[PDB]
Amino acid sequence: PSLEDLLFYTIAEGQEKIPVHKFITALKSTGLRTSDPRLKECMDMLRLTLQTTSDGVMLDKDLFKKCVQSNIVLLTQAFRRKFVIPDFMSFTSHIDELYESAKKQSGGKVADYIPQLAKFSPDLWGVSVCTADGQRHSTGDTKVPFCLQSCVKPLKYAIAVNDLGTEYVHRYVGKEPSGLRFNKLFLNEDDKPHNPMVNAGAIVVTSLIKQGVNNAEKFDYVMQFLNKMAGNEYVGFSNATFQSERESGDRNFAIGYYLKEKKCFPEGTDMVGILDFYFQLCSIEVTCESASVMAATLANGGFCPITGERVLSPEAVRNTLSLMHSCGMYDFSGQFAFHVGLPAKSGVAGGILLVVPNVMGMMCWSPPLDKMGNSVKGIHFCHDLVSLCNFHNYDNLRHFAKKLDPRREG
Amino acid sequence: PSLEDLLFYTIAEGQEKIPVHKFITALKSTGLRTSDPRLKECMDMLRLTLQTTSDGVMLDKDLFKKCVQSNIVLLTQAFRRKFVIPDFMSFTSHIDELYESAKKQSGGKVADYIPQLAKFSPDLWGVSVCTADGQRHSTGDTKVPFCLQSCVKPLKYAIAVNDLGTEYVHRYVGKEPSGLRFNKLFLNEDDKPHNPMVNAGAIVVTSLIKQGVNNAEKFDYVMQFLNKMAGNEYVGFSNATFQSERESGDRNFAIGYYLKEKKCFPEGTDMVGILDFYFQLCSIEVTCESASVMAATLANGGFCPITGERVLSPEAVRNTLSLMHSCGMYDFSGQFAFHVGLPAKSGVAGGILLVVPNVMGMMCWSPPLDKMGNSVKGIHFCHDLVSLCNFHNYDNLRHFAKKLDPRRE
Amino acid sequence: PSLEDLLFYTIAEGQEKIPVHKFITALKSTGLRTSDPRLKECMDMLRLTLQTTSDGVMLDKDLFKKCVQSNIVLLTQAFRRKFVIPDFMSFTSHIDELYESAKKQSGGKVADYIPQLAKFSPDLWGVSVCTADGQRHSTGDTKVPFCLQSCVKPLKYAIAVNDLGTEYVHRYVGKEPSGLRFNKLFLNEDDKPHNPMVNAGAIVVTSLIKQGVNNAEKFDYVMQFLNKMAGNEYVGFSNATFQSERESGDRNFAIGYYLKEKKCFPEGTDMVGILDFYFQLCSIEVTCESASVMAATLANGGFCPITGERVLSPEAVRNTLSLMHSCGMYDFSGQFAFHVGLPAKSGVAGGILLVVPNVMGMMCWSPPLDKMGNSVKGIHFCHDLVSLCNFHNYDNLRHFAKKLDPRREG
Amino acid sequence: PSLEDLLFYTIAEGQEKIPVHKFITALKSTGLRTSDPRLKECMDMLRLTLQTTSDGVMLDKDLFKKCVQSNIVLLTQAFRRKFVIPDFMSFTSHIDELYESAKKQSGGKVADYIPQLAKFSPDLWGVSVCTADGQRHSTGDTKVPFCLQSCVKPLKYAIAVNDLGTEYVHRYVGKEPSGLRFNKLFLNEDDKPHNPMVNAGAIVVTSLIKQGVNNAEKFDYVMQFLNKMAGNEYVGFSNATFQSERESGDRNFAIGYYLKEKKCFPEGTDMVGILDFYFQLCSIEVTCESASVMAATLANGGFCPITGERVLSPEAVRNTLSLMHSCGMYDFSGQFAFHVGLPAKSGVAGGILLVVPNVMGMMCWSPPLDKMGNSVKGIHFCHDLVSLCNFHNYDNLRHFAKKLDPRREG
Numbered sequence A, C, D: 001p002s003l004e005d006l007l008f009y010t011i012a013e014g015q016e017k018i019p020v021h022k023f024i025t026a027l028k029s030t031g032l033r034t035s036d037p038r039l040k041e042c043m044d045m046l047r048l049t050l051q052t053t054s055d056g057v058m059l060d061k062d063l064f065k066k067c068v069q070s071n072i073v074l075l076t077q078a079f080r081r082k083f084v085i086p087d088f089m090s091f092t093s094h095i096d097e098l099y100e101s102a103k104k105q106s107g108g109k110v111a112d113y114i115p116q117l118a119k120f121s122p123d124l125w126g127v128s129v130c131t132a133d134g135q136r137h138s139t140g141d142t143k144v145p146f147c148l149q150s151c152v153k154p155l156k157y158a159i160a161v162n163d164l165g166t167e168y169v170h171r172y173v174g175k176e177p178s179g180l181r182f183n184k185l186f187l188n189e190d191d192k193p194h195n196p197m198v199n200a201g202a203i204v205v206t207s208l209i210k211q212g213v214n215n216a217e218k219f220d221y222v223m224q225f226l227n228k229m230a231g232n233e234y235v236g237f238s239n240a241t242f243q244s245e246r247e248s249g250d251r252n253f254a255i256g257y258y259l260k261e262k263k264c265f266p267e268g269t270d271m272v273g274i275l276d277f278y279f280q281l282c283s284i285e286v287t288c289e290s291a292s293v294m295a296a297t298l299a300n301g302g303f304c305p306i307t308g309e310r311v312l313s314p315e316a317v318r319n320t321l322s323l324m325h326s327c328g329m330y331d332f333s334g335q336f337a338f339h340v341g342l343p344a345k346s347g348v349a350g351g352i353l354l355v356v357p358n359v360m361g362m363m364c365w366s367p368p369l370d371k372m373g374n375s376v377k378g379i380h381f382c383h384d385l386v387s388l389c390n391f392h393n394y395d396n397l398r399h400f401a402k403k404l405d406p407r408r409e410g
Numbered sequence B: 001p002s003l004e005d006l007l008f009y010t011i012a013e014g015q016e017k018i019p020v021h022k023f024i025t026a027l028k029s030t031g032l033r034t035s036d037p038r039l040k041e042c043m044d045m046l047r048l049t050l051q052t053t054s055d056g057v058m059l060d061k062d063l064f065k066k067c068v069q070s071n072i073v074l075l076t077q078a079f080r081r082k083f084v085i086p087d088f089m090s091f092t093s094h095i096d097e098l099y100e101s102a103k104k105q106s107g108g109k110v111a112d113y114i115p116q117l118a119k120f121s122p123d124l125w126g127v128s129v130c131t132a133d134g135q136r137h138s139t140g141d142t143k144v145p146f147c148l149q150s151c152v153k154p155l156k157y158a159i160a161v162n163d164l165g166t167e168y169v170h171r172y173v174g175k176e177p178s179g180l181r182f183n184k185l186f187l188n189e190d191d192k193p194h195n196p197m198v199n200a201g202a203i204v205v206t207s208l209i210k211q212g213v214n215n216a217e218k219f220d221y222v223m224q225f226l227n228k229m230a231g232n233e234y235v236g237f238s239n240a241t242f243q244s245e246r247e248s249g250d251r252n253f254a255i256g257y258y259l260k261e262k263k264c265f266p267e268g269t270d271m272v273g274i275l276d277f278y279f280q281l282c283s284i285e286v287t288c289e290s291a292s293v294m295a296a297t298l299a300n301g302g303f304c305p306i307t308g309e310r311v312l313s314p315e316a317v318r319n320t321l322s323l324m325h326s327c328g329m330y331d332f333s334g335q336f337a338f339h340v341g342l343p344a345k346s347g348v349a350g351g352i353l354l355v356v357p358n359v360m361g362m363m364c365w366s367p368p369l370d371k372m373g374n375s376v377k378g379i380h381f382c383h384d385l386v387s388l389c390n391f392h393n394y395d396n397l398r399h400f401a402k403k404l405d406p407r408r409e
Ligand SMILES: O=C(CC1CC1)Nc1nnc(OC2CCN(c3nnc(NC(=O)CC4CC4)s3)CC2)s1
Pocket: A184, A185, A186, A187, A188, A189, A190, A191, A258, C181, D184, D185, D186, D187, D188, D189
């Protein structure tokens, strides 16, 4: 027996040679993209033979073997329906329907704080999916860049814990939700911020990352991190939104001084510089596609699913998912934890970073916010999603009424 | 082919016949108990053949099939190691280690506010396990009855939602945690109690179950329900602790009158009777074994794992696990959700009802409480549990460090 | 020289005999009423001589001497303008204009939570004055009975301190205002009610009065007290209001059980009987005239100005005035102390018991309440009052701009 | 008749000539000081004639009148025991006892957050009195300069209301005390600081004074203003304390940014300049004598009692006295109002500015503070003060137990 040849006959159809396009559409049907970094060696040798013998273009059994040799094990699971979502083609059409149901909920008002988010038009709406296995799909405005804003708070919290450990980080910031009556308080009762997802907590967390180095190298350190989470897809930076966040963070300056007075930063902290670093981190840009890979990195125990390098310790992604659960959506986190039951983080540019643990990561983006600060279309999508699939943290995997389970076949 | 006969040879070893003791010892190894309700027809026909002629306790291929015919699909799933924890005999050996390691944490104070918990000894400590498949194990004082107290709060919430639906119930009670600055408040901004796990909420939820019937029959109804959840294992009642809660619930009466004044009960409520009903509900008795089965009913989407009966609507069970997550351990719910990440509910008798969704249900019980109200041994156990296995709600099932996963071989 | 005799000539005006009616109106102009208990001896012998020498209504120098001999010292202070308000006749016309200006403020809603307060018409409006010297004036519906409701809280607090002293009472009850959103909280940090003027505080105080006796004599003990404070004018009791307040005091019972749980009562307290007693004290009736004298005993260091009876210790009256200043008018107490700056207590029947220390007491009554619980016309009257006179707690008695000073002459 | 020598024989003894020393000693007996500004012309005229004659240090009836002619009306009330305290010489002997009893209370901690208050000795302790009539007395370290710190809070609030009126000023700051459970919050429910006596309130009040001019002229405006209030006694400035207050007022900047974000300042405010000005205002220096005169301007309806100048509108003095009543002693304000019943304001240098309305003003100073921020010796002194005399705001002027009344003679 030989794994490359058994997969040959699977696609061969009892026939004698396989056209390459028939192989290519067979592959994309799995949800894989031909640009997948785990597939480069296979694709590089297909493009080569598609030069060496323009003659063709059909593959013997032993040239198919020459190309899939390198990435055979990943290819077999794709064609033997072993990915976490086996029928990826039907799942994506569900996403498409869920997308179009959100697309009609046209309320909310775009963030007006700076001329840079006000710049964004309300009809932009994109969702993109990345599974824990690398299967992708997008629909809508998924290649438009936008800033993470408070979508970055879980990403840097993971880095802090990854680099420093739970006990250190949570010596400086709590691990509970405020309570719907304390969106106004900076500190909890032990004089630490309530959790990493609130502005005072995010700021203290920023104060821990890569201490003793200057603000340029801290920034590069975090972005090399954010690149690994996204498999080197688009991670950018808008100086435009940074400058205006610099002139309008009166409240953040209020928090900054309060924290200095109550000695909540590590010793030797330059608080006014830390705020600048914090302002920068909120102006990091992503698209819906690149961020969906980040979310899937958290969904995948810290391994970036399209590259397979370990980016975060399991201790960091577990901690981050727990605090996204309960403190991820501003005042909506209680209701969101109840009705949707997914770790998510929302941001004021209209982004909602969504994680379905052990399944997939997502990014939804629509600039118009509701009155609690969350993307209107995004929130509508996430209710529609859990109402359709048994992804709620406390759905049952065995008995789930008329919910669909995409992890199953028939 | 013949699957009753296929299983005969699995246990028979290609040898003559199966001694019956060798069959049941194989059976207990799976984690099933011979008293399993789904096995009665098999056991009934074992009791029949053991009267045929008392020695030569051996089963041919056709008398073995004579007994296992009725329950063959469940028996093969056990013997083809298809249960949620395949190597169950090894998992229980870890339970034993976790239990006996927790046994050494002898700090805490027994609740003394009533003489009925004050008579309970601090050295009692029991742990019982029930999988989503009916595999059982216990260690310690697992057959001693004790009151649920506020471990009953999620159970009646489930009943309420099961019978009346999310939207009605949550017209009368919120669905978020108070906030560690609010175990002192009864009502949130909308003048409803914060969630079903706090006393004002539980009291309101109690006012929803089986309205229009009197308190005797409401109680009979809830007992019938808890019987379904526990597979007809021990559910009782101690009139003693009921009396003392009745003479000692000044705080409960304070809450009741606040709720009556701010009109949080359904119309036609006899508020002072509902308090009486509530006191009864907290004096319902369970053992660790019986209650662990109730926990497993929640772990299993509302189906009782030792009977197969559908006991709760999926909407009821999801909701309850959701609110056990964030509001289940008094002031410890935040720290508990973060470190343990399992839906749990604690009570002042020393109980902790624990759910590991899609795996198993649990009940731990040792009366000495910590200064937040949670059983000291219990809390130590659930930390040790999640630290050993990847049962944390936000562990990864694929990449989980040096944690052990009992669902795998 | 001669005590009665020059006082004869002061009123005689060089004449031989004084018409008796001319004596009576001269006396009434001082503000004294001829029914004053400190004047009974003089009046008894005035009508007696109007029988014994029934023909000829005039008094020589020695028959005037026959009648005023008993009350001469009080009589001279009245006629030598030595009373706290010398020109009482001009002060009253101001009261009347102030009354007529409030009579136009026709907004508000009458308390309807029980049918007995709903019984009262919105157009009733009464004001009565009693100085620290016994001068009286009324205008409007000043002889209509109504319940004190929370106007009784300062009065029973005084009895408690009078009988037990500051230090004991304030073991069980605070002495500060809540803070304008701690009105739903029953207890402060030390697990005592915030002050005696909140319902929880009043209830605890009720628990200290005459401990160890049954409710009938406790009630008679308190009422025996109030009669003295009012110089034995109308103090009554509405059984109707008592029944309906007990029927419907769910929140009060809520408070009662809460206080028992947090052990706020003295040992051996029967909590539900104390509640019954509290409801009774809230259904005690006064008219504007009878209560205005009670207010004056507080204005007068504890001496009832129309009888000379010492009714309350100076420690009791100081404490009670202190807490009416800051906590007496529900959520309006801060605004009321700022703008009016007088010790006052409001009640849900529409009464406002007002004290001008060292000057006078008043009670205003109009059933319509505003949305904080205070009589609309009542509150309007007290603003008008202090804008007119230097009665504000911190006006200056020497430099006071264009305010009028009734304690002074011309 | 001639009221110049009606007074001559009063001091003369039926005698001959009056020695000059006997006259001024008779004068200091009144409590007036020979340095009284209202006595300049008289003192200048004593200084002139005590040049002419080294022989005959004595005053005929015609040269006494030559000197006292101009200030005769003030001198007559002094010798005619018409001052607010007729027997001032005994009242100061009580002040001495009250001082010596406080001298024994050696607890507390000198404020150490800045080295400028930290080098102050713990045994410095001074008390100074100034009546509404200009009578003066001091005991202890009454000429040692120290900073007002938060004792300046009422003074600038007075200026603010004096220049713009109550209604404008209170658009930017409330008028009630927070409540002993909200000393941590910056803003009330209407998004204004709770009152002028808390740091958020003072900062906003600072933003209203003499708007539109630069900080140099703003400071000069307030400095003369305080000059008028103190009758031109010592008012200074410690640049040392100002410097240490700006490098360590982390909480103050936090407050400023919060107020800036929630738009609590009038439009056109340079928030960080207002903080600079505020720090300056807290580093104004006084002595006990000079500050007690400021207290006396507040006791006197806005007239400085040693110069006769009108410095504050009565509306300004009422308002400030009202808010010193309830918010003047930090978390001790409720207990202080209940037990002492006088408007006072404390500051962290150990000062307590105390007002007994219509009687006298005071400044007490001992740097050791208690655990709430008030001078230990200071607080002990004012308790002892009011238990001795009927100065409590709700004492009775007629029935006041065995308390002493310094306003009466026998
Ligand atoms: O909203 C309001 C109106 C509200 C309706 C009456 N006022 C506001 N004024 N300022 C605001 O901003 C923050 C600034 C930082 N700050 C703290 N946050 N956390 C703290 N510590 C604890 O709670 C520890 C417990 C005690 C042991 S103190 C105080 C408030 S809100």
